[PDB]
Amino acid sequence: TSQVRQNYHQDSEAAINRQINLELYASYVYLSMSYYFDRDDVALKNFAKYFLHQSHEEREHAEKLMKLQNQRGGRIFLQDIQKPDCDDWESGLNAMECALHLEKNVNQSLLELHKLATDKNDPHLCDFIETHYLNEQVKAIKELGDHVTNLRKMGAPESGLAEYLFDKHTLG
């Protein structure tokens, strides 16, 4: 047992390790989406930048969980990072809809992590989740909802003009 470990339940340590893999997976999903929009037959360069930025942020989220695991005296155990669900993401609106779905799934896992930390009376882990993850997830979900709404209202995905102008005026 680690000389620094205090009030850190084995279930919490394992759930943090599962959260680490989920953030790496989400980073990988966003990376896949980014270079889809870099294709010569898709060619939405700000969609590609937007998702690449989201990819780097998710990987930063994963590294902060790895730091937290070591701060509390747990041990990081890494798993395979699963390849994303699709190779072809269809359209800008479809990608935005899949990102919304992904962020709500990450949010669900974070809420279950908070429930477990509360059940194990770990207020430091509760505050860690609240300070660095919960409002970031709410903000991301609201922003992705806004984007989906505007794209639908503009006439995406049938209107290629809509996705072109959204890429210019909202993501540029």
Contacting its own copies within 112-171 (CB under 8 A): 114-115, 118, 121, 123-124, 126-131, 134-135, 138-139, 141-142, 145-150, 152-155, 159-165, 168-169
Q: Is 45 in the site for its own copies (CB under 8 A)?
A: yes
Minimum separation from the CB atom of position 167 to its own copies (A) = 9
Count, residues in the chain:
172
Is 122 in contact with 15 (CB distance < 8 Å)?
A: no
Sequence-distant (≥ 6) Cβ neighbours of residue 24 within 8 angstroms? 58, 59, 62, 81
Query: Which residue in 15, 16, 31, 98 binds its own copies (CB under 8 A)?
Result: 31
- Closest to Ca ion by CB, 8 vs 128, is 128
Question: Considering only CA atoms, which of 77, 63, 61, 62 is closest in space to residue 17?
Answer: 77
The answer to whether 103 is a known ligand-binding residue is yes
Site string for its own copies, 66-95 (x = CB under 8 A): xx-xxxxx-xxxxxxxxxx--x--------
Distance CA 25, CA 8 (A): 25
